[PDB]
Paper text:
In this study, we used cryoEM methods to reconstruct the structure of the RHDV capsid to an overall estimated resolution limit of 6.5 Å (5.5 Å in the shell domain) and solved the crystal structures of the S and P domains of the RHDV VP60 protein both at 2.0 Å resolution. The crystal structures of the S and P domains of VP60 were docked into the high-resolution cryoEM map to construct a pseudo-atomic model of the complete RHDV capsid.
Numbering used by the authors:
A (entry chain A), B (entry chain A): 67 to 229
The structure:
Amino acid sequence: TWRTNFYYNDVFTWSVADAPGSILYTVQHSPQNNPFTAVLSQMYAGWAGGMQFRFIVAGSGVFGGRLVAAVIPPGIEIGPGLEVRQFPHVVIDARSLEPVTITMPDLRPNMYHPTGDPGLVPTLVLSVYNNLINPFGGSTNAIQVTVETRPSDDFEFVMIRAP
Amino acid sequence: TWRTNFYYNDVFTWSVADAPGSILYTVQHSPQNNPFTAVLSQMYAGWAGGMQFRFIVAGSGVFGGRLVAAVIPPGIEIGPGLEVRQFPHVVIDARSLEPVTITMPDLRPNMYHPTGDPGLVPTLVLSVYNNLINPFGGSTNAIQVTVETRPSDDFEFVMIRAP
């Protein structure tokens, strides 16, 4: 189905100008981060469970540099000097050919979350850990990173919404 | 589920001024006529099957008059002198206490219909057959008719839509 495949959600740019600690991508955990859960969330009041995010770095396994994708607990705001490796995180190397996937989990497995006004949910943040390096000639000094998502196996919608 | 219950879709007015042959309500057969199929139709390319429409006339079983609800084949346009009883139809009496339900069926059970640009689909039309009569004093000369829908048992969505 749609819930077993990853689907394109977004894209962001990573350039040699983005210094360590810069945040290049951020998103609150929500059904709006997948195009199918975004549709279905309009007919349910509640949801629960994780969402997987898969990043493909278009650096032809050649560029140097690294991002850290980290899951930030609710009501912690993240700055640019902010350490994130204390949070559940995965490292994304510019030279990797393969996709790197991170699970944004449900941090409150105790209570269904609203599909409406979200309350207190985790945030996914992607920050520069090592500077992007274009070895040798540019003039390509920026690359793109695609973001695709799929609901985790524990993702669910509940409570039909009164229309 | 949502597909077993009728849900409010719309409302229309019937007044003593509406003469026989007036059209008081009309709608193309479509998933947009139920609030749940309207949501789900955004993630599918195709659909098929019938939709039930239930009308409750708010005439306290007292007003005189009748409407005919008729299903009009595609590409027949209906005027106000237009006979409809040759089409599948049900009669709605102003004096009825109970709801009156009509099935708008899939007239092309041979081919899934698009949820997008609809092509050629039947139309539900409600026309005055006998004038609404307020016996005795008004000053209520108009009543409302609520419209509720539910997918028929053969209703289906197919072909996940490329987002």
